[PDB]
Design a protein around this ligand. Structure first.
Ligand code: BCB
Ligand code: BCB
Ligand code: BCB
Ligand SMILES: C/C=C1/c2cc3[nH]c4c(c3C)C(=O)[C@H](C(=O)OC)c4c3nc(cc4[nH]c(cc(n2)[C@@H]1C)c(C(C)=O)c4C)[C@@H](C)[C@@H]3CCC(=O)OC/C=C(/C)CCC[C@H](C)CCC[C@H](C)CCCC(C)C
Ligand SMILES: C/C=C1/c2cc3[nH]c4c(c3C)C(=O)[C@H](C(=O)OC)c4c3nc(cc4[nH]c(cc(n2)[C@@H]1C)c(C(C)=O)c4C)[C@@H](C)[C@@H]3CCC(=O)OC/C=C(\C)CCC[C@H](C)CCC[C@H](C)CCCC(C)C
Ligand SMILES: CC(C)=CCC/C(C)=C/CC/C(C)=C/CC/C(C)=C/CC/C(C)=C/CC/C(C)=C/CC/C(C)=C/CC1=C(C)C(=O)c2ccccc2C1=O
Ligand code: HEC
Ligand code: HEC
Ligand code: HEC
Ligand code: HEC
Ligand SMILES: CC(C)=CCC/C(C)=C/C=C/C(C)=C/C=C/C(C)=C/C=C\C=C(C)\C=C\C=C(/C)CC/C=C(/C)CCCC(C)C
Ligand SMILES: CCCCCCCCCCCC[N+](C)(C)[O-]
Ligand SMILES: CCCCCCCCCCCC[N+](C)(C)[O-]
Ligand SMILES: CCCCCCCCCCCC[N+](C)(C)[O-]
Ligand SMILES: [Fe+3]
Lengths: 323, 258, 332, 273
């Protein structure tokens, strides 16, 4: 077996490299240090970190959002520190419970939620600028930023775009561990079972495919690490036996194959499509479809099944039944 | 009346369903599957004789060439014509189209099958700032083994047949990634040096076990041009040599395990 | 952390749909033994003599019974409601016609309520019916009642923690969670849905596309109604010791016909019956109860599904005393 | 027929069973003995699906559903129309999947590469067994397994979840979901990164390993490195099912209540109760 694919047997140390960027080389703070146990399964060097304007703006806005959330959470346990740790998972900051439409809600019923939403959104935009500009500063393409953009766009969809399209802030995602989980069922119940939303299906198809692709790609590179397949950039520009064997393994298995470069386009595309499909689904939901199951029945797609115990009429529609 | 309704039993969501499939198949078929073809294409048939005109599908399945501007000068364009020149010491075991080939000579030296190397540039891989990337420690003197880990320098190398075959004299390190990639070893009784990819090395505290080849087979490991640097093609030649041993070192390794 | 196998499973939908009950035998046995404490029927007595309307002085509900029949009732009532306290719980030792103790007047209304249940709500209690025991289980205060705010523990026979106490505000989220099967749902399904008939449980649209005029802005129900319905369903499931597939094919929670079991219809009647009981029999009794029975808003204790069911899909695993005590209903 | 670089790799040997008898290609496809068994099982399973589907109500692909037997048949054979076809198809599936895996190890040996890919492919085969074999064994009926249909299998996932009131609170599920999410995110990062270095645009020159690490050090203060991200990606993806299988096997055999209630081990510690 190739033990190098499991962990680094003999680690190496050397002077720390610094690639200069078009700006901000002085905003790298911290002194690098080395972790021997990290170095078994990764690169041993931790830090320094770049510390630009957008990154600080992100930390500023983020912490503001975190603080607004934590304070409202603590209010929910009347500031008892012990119950706060006990009940942490169950605590939350909720959008309005009452229907104000799109009017700004009272602070006690969703205003603080809206506030925390604003500052998180600013934090996401600020970090996006960091992710984008750091690439151009180092003379790299902006591929990560465009993937990250789709992920931010999906959050905005469930956070505020879908609420504004249907016209009620009551539909946003709460802040908190269990409560953001509870939203998923409330939403799916409201809109007629999300299994029958084709864009749920698409998103899941791509999410599962990301698991398929990264398991397959990761396994492939490790299987050709003896020929240096991990040095992917020079295998793109000068095809070595590593990527020839990787390409032929798949071709002989499934009948076709990618290149060392194109496999990353596949992977990048699949990842992006998780978020793009999710967003189309949310954008259609509530605006143009009210019950995804009935929409599938309307178009003849839903499965049906025999009764097992007897079919049961809606009692509310029998004559003389109470309301 | 209904949000999203259109005339004659259409609704918007129904249209977007069709559009979404169209987008997917467009990207997969017209973009990704052509990107997949920037290597190894056009395919090779039992002699493609029509030298006067190309067959239509071979033009259609290819993307427009792209050019990489290399970091230390030069350009590479893909796809491009790159036939495999060197004579392969293989013979067809049958007349069938996809019957396997057989090695006629010694497949490790002849560099066929799992011992095959790619025809990469006879060029030394470089750091950001132009230096040789893969160098032995005698040259890379500001690099050390990390405290905790076996220093293999001095340890013996035991081959598959249990015979000591040489002594590890140096480690080659990737200066770009801070990662050891090869051990250098003197092959006992042959007055030469050989490189070994770490991935073929079982690093124990008193020995380096190497199961891919026999002790005698260390004699014909591809040699380098220079002592203190390696070319990309040499890296392929060296790595491939041991991998060829997985199937060829003994007659029994190519036959079925059951 | 975990419950050792095997599990008992049942089937409630077409094969392949994963519908049905999942039960831990130990737990079922412990509930079976708790419920087997149901006292057996007192021996039948011969109907003899005049109606007790002519014999006793203050008999307004049970007036058509004879003396032995009526005293048999009174023995059964004491066994079911106040066995440890005895007849003097409701009566003056020296004047059995005195209404001076509040349990007397309450018991009279409870008699009317119980016969109402067995006569007007057969759509839910069928031929099984209820007795005083179904709720009370041998104590004057039933172990499972609800106030207009959640209380812990669920069984008022256990002693509350400082945090469990309703006046400790830091424990509200936990009081609420334990009523909704430990979910973080921020809604009290009892005051929202079971205390009165003011709210609609259904939230799911019955059309594929959104209908114009109910689908935008303030025309829309807030999403919180869906959280609240879900919370009601968590609470209902936990109260019967069962899961959703007992009643629903989760393919379409809102559909009836083949998508619902007959138990879903019975449950629907149960919601209406509990509303009737609370609005018309139990909530008015804050006039007749001491202040130590009332909640922080002067409300009487009221009933939910757990009051009768106590964690079993049929109260007391289907035990019935209807044929043994005709005077409790149904009434012609 | 062959890629420009393919011929020198197309050598004899590396099989596990049969030696030369099946050591050949058909078009691009390597065959081998497990190529043959795979096609056998695929042909058998697809036949049974077709025969079973024709005895059913509809031909709409979204509505076809081959279902397991009623629970009352326990672990025994069930009549073909009411569960038997499901039983037969399931065995063909396992035959096909395992054949496919073993075929990949043969291809791996011939090329002199690691067996990591069939190894990784064991994880989803294992998960399939958890759902269709192991958990139904632990509960005592094939009836607890999921049905074969595009949309019908979602109805089973649906009801299965709601049998435990809110499946999201299943701790094995929480772990599984977290790996699905971070895996999809890492693959975007990894693919994004590689493309960004090889394709800076504008005729700018392609960058370097050191640029790769500089980028992530700058943005998040750490870079795991080239080889390591591939190890991590296999680890992340594999743990979607490796941890998830516990949350699945637990539900029913080792937990019968709602999954929110399970967290009482935390909430109901007397210290802060
Ligand atoms: C425990 C939970 C499970 C689950 C939960 C689930 C959900 C919630 C959703 C799906 C969806 C899907 N599932 Mg399903 N599922 C599927 C297959 C499918 C596809 C129909 C679809 C998209 C899959 C995908 O893109 O993956 C990534 C793989 C890729 C991209 C490679 C391509 C695979 C190809 C698209 C699959 C096509 C398979 C054929 C339709 C079936 C084979 C037919 C035979 C005759 C050849 C198979 C083959 C299995 C097996 C063998 O176990 C399986 C098990 C499960 N699914 C478990 C029961 N799955 C989605 C859907 O839209 O269903 C209608 C969906 O929303
Ligand atoms: C009962 C309810 C269910 C439900 C309800 C549901 C809803 C309501 C929605 C989904 C959605 C999705 N569901 Mg689904 N679901 C899924 C899978 C999925 C995902 C593939 C998809 C997209 C979500 C995502 O990736 O977010 C992970 C990624 C996110 C959230 C992006 C975050 C990026 C952000 C930049 C991160 C930054 C954070 C900051 C650093 C932190 C700062 C915080 C501080 C300041 C507070 C599977 C595999 C199954 C199975 C096996 O049954 C399933 C069943 C269910 N879902 C049931 C049907 N699901 C979404 C969808 O696709 O709908 C069409 C969706 O909207
Ligand atoms: C109401 C019910 C829900 C539910 C019920 C549920 C259940 C009951 C189970 C899961 C499980 C899982 N859920 Mg969950 N879920 C998930 C995500 C997930 C997955 C990560 C995880 C594993 C799925 C699996 O086992 O695939 C299975 C995939 C397999 C087996 C692939 C087999 C492939 C095979 C080897 C090869 C197939 C070959 C083809 C036939 C060949 C054809 C190819 C063609 C192209 C030639 C998300 C992201 C969400 C969101 C966003 O809400 C969600 C919500 C829900 N889940 C709802 C709350 N979910 C599973 C889990 O791990 O739980 C802990 C699980 O058992
Ligand atoms: C299919 C597409 C997938 C996808 C894609 C992508 N996702 C990306 C990118 C892409 C392309 C990036 O380029 C960017 C990034 O930068 O990666 C390195 C990023 C992000 N996705 C994060 C979280 C996330 N993605 C989720 C999901 C999906 N994403 C879906 C699945 C989910 C889920 C599932 O809920 C979560 C929680 C953050 C790590 C990060 C934003 C931080 C932020 O917006 O600041 C917000 C400001 C803060 C102050 C928050 C502070 C804490 C966080 C953890 C940040 C700390 C970092 C700090 C450097 C620590 C110092 C350590 C040092 C001392 C040693
Ligand atoms: C965490 C681990 C991840 C992971 C990993 C890997 N995945 C791999 C590898 C690795 C490493 C490969 O090396 C191998 C491959 O070669 O890649 C191209 C493979 C593959 N992953 C496939 C499907 C896949 N991966 C999924 C998930 C993950 N994978 C997770 C995420 C999912 C879902 C649902 O998520 C799907 C659908 C096939 C494409 C391929 C097998 C082909 C086959 O097996 O041929 C043999 C079988 C056939 C060609 C058809 C057989 C038909 C049977 C007999 C009759 C049908 C019965 C069937 C049960 C009916 C179902 C109906 C349905 C509607 C319910
Ligand atoms: C008729 C007959 C007798 C035949 C005998 C021979 C025989 C056994 C034939 C088999 C016939 C069968 C069953 C064919 C079916 C083939 C199958 C299962 C195809 C599935 C294809 C699917 C859907 C794959 C999903 C994954 C996906 C999107 C892949 C696209 C990208 C690719 C090609 C990834 C594979 C791939 C990865 C993962 C790399 O990392 C890598 C690194 C460097 C170079 C190349 C690659 C590479 O190609
Ligand atoms: C509360 C739950 C009671 C217990 C315990 C007992 N009794 Fe009772 N009794 C109760 C009520 C509400 C009434 C009025 C009934 C009506 O139909 O209006 C009664 C009535 C009687 C009577 C008739 C008294 C009279 O009006 O003259 C008798 C003789 C009587 N009760 C006796 C009795 C005995 C012996 C009990 C212990 C076995 C007993 N009662 C318990 C309420 C309650
Ligand atoms: C559930 C539907 C019940 C049935 C059936 C019966 N009772 Fe009841 N009772 C119920 C509640 C929710 C309450 C309020 C809590 C309380 O303690 O008041 C009561 C109250 C009483 C009382 C008053 C006891 C006290 O407050 O100390 C009595 C005397 C009583 N109930 C008697 C009684 C009898 C005789 C019943 C059968 C005819 C009966 N109850 C049925 C709930 C339910
Ligand atoms: C039987 C004792 C039930 C169990 C267990 C669950 N539900 Fe239920 N549900 C039940 C009824 C009788 C009704 C109708 C209520 C009415 O007053 O009309 C409902 C309703 C729902 C709904 C709303 C459907 C609609 O038309 O909008 C939902 C979404 C729902 N139920 C979901 C649900 C879930 C998730 C459950 C397990 C947690 C569950 N129910 C259990 C009866 C019963
Ligand atoms: C006492 C006054 C009750 C209250 C309050 C509720 N239920 Fe009930 N239920 C009661 C009886 C006596 C029976 C009959 C048992 C029998 O053998 O038929 C029932 C039955 C049900 C069922 C049927 C279960 C079955 O296995 O067929 C269901 C689903 C049910 N009850 C649900 C239910 C709900 C949701 C309630 C709160 C709204 C509820 N019940 C209250 C007695 C009483
Ligand atoms: C014009 C103005 C007035 C209105 C528009 C404002 C606007 C743009 C609002 C947008 C709001 C949005 C996008 C809301 C979206 C909210 C979403 C998706 C929330 C989702 C999940 C939230 C979770 C899980 C939060 C949990 C909170 C905590 C755990 C407490 C915070 C503490 C932490 C340490 C955070 C850790 C989070 C994680 C890394 C573990
Ligand atoms: C919507 C996000 C707004 C955030 C504003 C704060 C970010 C400052 C951006 C500074 C970028 C400077 N630059 C281009 C040289 O990197
Ligand atoms: C996971 C959900 C998938 C459900 C797929 C249903 C798609 C229905 C699209 C119908 C196309 C329109 N038409 C005319 C063919 O009915
Ligand atoms: C539900 C998500 C859909 C994902 C579709 C991706 C499938 C890849 C198809 C590969 C096609 C192969 N080939 C050679 C025919 O082009
Ligand atoms: Fe890669």
């Amino acid at each position: 077996a190739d033990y190098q694919t499991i962990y680094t047997q003999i680690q190496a140390r050397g002077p720390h490299i610094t690639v200069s960027g078009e700006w901000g080389d002085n905003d790298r703070v911290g002194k690098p240090f080395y972790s021997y146990w990290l170095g078994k399964i990764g690169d041993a060097q931790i830090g320094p970190i770049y510390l630009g304007a957008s990154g600080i703006a992100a930390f500023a806005f983020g912490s503001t959002a975190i603080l607004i959330i934590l304070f409202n959470m603590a209010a929910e346990v009347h500031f008892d520190p012990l119950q706060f740790f006990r009940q942490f998972f169950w605590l939350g900051l909720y959008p309005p419970k009452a229907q104000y439409g799109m009017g700004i809600p009272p602070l006690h019923d969703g205003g603080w939620w809206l506030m925390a939403g604003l500052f998180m959104t600013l934090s996401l935009g600020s970090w996006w600028i960091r992710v984008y500009s750091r690439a151009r500063a180092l003379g790299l393409g902006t591929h990560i930023a465009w993937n990250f953009a789709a992920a931010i766009f999906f959050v905005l969809c469930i956070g505020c775009i879908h609420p504004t399209l249907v016209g009620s802030w009551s539909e946003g995602v709460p802040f908190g561990i269990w409560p953001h989980i509870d939203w998923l069922t409330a939403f799916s119940i409201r809109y007629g079972n999300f299994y029958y939303c084709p864009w749920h299906g698409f998103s899941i198809g791509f999410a599962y495919g990301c698991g398929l692709l990264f398991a397959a790609h990761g396994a492939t590179i490790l299987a050709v690490a003896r020929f240096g397949g991990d040095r992917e950039i020079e295998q793109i520009t000068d095809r070595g036996t590593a990527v020839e064997r990787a390409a032929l393994f798949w071709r002989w298995t499934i009948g076709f194959n990618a290149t060392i470069e194109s496999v990353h386009r596949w992977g990048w595309f699949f990842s992006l499509m998780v978020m793009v499909s999710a967003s189309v689904g949310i954008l259609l939901t509530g605006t143009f479809v009210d019950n995804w199951y009935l929409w599938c029945v309307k178009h003849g797609a839903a499965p049906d099944y025999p009764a097992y115990l007897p079919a049961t009429p809606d009692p509310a529609s029998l004559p003389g039944a109470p309301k | 009346m209904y949000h999203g309704a259109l005339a004659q039993h259409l609704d918007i969501a129904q249209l977007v369903w069709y559009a979404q499939w169209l987008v997917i198949w467009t990207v997969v078929l017209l973009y990704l599957r052509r990107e997949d073809r920037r290597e190894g294409y056009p395919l090779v048939e039992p002699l493609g004789l029509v030298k006067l005109a190309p067959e239509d599908g071979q033009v259609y399945e290819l993307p427009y060439p792209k050019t990489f501007v290399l970091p230390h000068g030069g350009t590479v364009t893909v796809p491009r014509r790159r036939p495999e020149t060197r004579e392969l010491k293989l013979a067809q075991t049958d007349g069938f189209e996809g019957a396997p080939l057989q090695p006629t000579g010694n497949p490790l030296v002849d560099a066929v099958g799992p011992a095959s190397y790619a025809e990469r540039a006879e060029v030394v891989d470089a750091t950001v700032d132009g230096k040789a990337k893969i160098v032995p420690l005698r040259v890379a003197t500001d690099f050390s083994i990390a405290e905790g880990d076996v220093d293999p320098r001095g340890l013996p190398v035991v081959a598959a047949d249990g015979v000591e075959a040489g002594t590890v004299t140096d480690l080659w390190v990737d200066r770009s990634e801070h990662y050891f990639r090869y051990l250098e070893l003197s092959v006992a009784g042959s007055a030469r040096t050989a490189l070994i990819p770490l991935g073929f090395c079982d690093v124990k505290k008193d020995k380096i076990v190497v199961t891919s080849i026999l002790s005698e087979q260390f004699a014909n490991v591809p040699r380098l041009q220079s002592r203190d640097q390696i070319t990309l093609r040499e890296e392929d030649k060296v790595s491939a040599y041991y991998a060829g041993g997985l199937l060829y070192a003994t007659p029994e390794r190519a036959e079925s395990l059951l | 952390c975990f419950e050792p196998p095997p599990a008992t499973t049942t089937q409630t939908g077409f094969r392949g749909l994963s519908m049905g009950e999942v039960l831990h035998p130990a737990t079922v046995k412990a509930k079976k033994e708790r419920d087997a404490q149901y006292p057996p029927a007192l021996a039948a007595v011969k109907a003899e003599g005049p109606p007790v309307s002519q014999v006793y002085k203050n008999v307004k509900v049970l007036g058509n019974l004879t003396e032995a029949e009526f005293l048999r009732t009174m023995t059964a009532i004491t066994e079911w409601v106040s066995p440890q306290e005895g007849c003097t719980y409701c009566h003056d030792e020296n004047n059995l016609a005195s209404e001076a103790k509040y349990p007397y007047v309450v018991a009279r209304r409870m008699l009317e309520m119980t016969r109402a249940i067995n006569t007007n709500w057969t759509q839910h209690v069928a031929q099984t019916g209820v007795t005083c025991y179904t709720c009370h289980r041998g104590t004057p205060l039933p172990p499972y009642v609800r106030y207009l705010e959640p209380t812990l523990p669920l069984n008022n026979r256990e002693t509350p923690t400082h945090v469990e106490r309703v006046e400790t505000r830091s424990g509200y989220v936990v009081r609420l969670a334990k009523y909704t099967a430990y979910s973080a749902l921020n809604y009290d399904p009892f005051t929202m849905f079971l205390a009165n008939d003011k709210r609609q449980v259904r939230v799911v649209p019955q059309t594929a596309l959104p209908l114009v005029g109910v689908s935008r802005g303030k025309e829309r129900r807030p999403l919180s109604d869906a959280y609240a319905t879900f919370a009601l369903m968590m609470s209902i499931s936990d109260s019967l010791g069962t899961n959703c597939t007992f009643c629903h094919n989760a393919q379409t929670f809102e559909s009836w016909g083949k998508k619902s079991t007959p138990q879903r219809a019975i449950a629907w009647w149960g919601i209406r019956m509990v509303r009737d009981l609370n609005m018309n029999y139990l909530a008015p009794l804050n006039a007749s109860l001491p202040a130590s029975r009332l909640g922080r808003q002067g409300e009487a204790p009221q009933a939910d599904c757990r009051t009768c069911h106590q964690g079993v899909t049929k109260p007391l695993f289907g035990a019935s005393r209807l044929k043994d005590y005709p005077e409790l209903g149904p009434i012609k | 027929a062959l890629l420009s670089f393919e011929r020198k790799y197309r050598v004899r040997g590396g099989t596990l069973i049969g030696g030369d008898l099946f050591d050949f290609w058909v078009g691009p496809y390597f065959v081998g003995f497990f190529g043959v068994s795979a096609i056998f099982f695929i042909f058998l399973g697809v036949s049974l699906i077709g025969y079973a589907a024709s005895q059913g109500p509809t031909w709409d692909p979204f509505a076809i559903s081959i279902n397991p037997p009623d629970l009352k048949y326990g672990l025994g054979a069930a009549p073909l129309l009411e569960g038997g076809f499901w039983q037969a198809i399931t065995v063909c599936a396992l035959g096909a999947f395992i054949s496919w895996m073993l075929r990949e190890v043969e291809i791996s040996r011939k090329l002199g590469i690691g067996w990591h890919v069939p190894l990784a492919f064991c994880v989803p085969i294992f998960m399939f067994c958890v759902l269709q074999v192991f958990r139904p064994l632990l509960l005592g009926s094939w009836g607890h397994a999921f049905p074969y249909g595009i949309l019908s299998h979602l109805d089973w996932v649906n009801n299965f979840g709601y049998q435990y009131l809110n499946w999201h609170y299943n701790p094995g599920h929480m772990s599984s979901v977290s790996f699905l999410f971070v895996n999809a995110m890492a693959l975007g990062l990894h693919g994004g990164l590689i493309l960004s270095v090889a394709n800076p645009g504008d005729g700018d020159k392609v960058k370097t390993a050191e640029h790769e690490n500089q980028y992530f050090r700058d943005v998040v203060g750490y870079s795991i490195g080239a080889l390591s991200i591939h190890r991590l990606g296999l680890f992340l993806a594999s743990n979607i099912f490796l941890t998830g299988a516990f949350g699945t096997i637990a539900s029913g055999p080792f937990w019968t209540r709602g999954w929110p209630e399970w967290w009482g081990w935390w909430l109901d510690i007397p210290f802060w109760s």
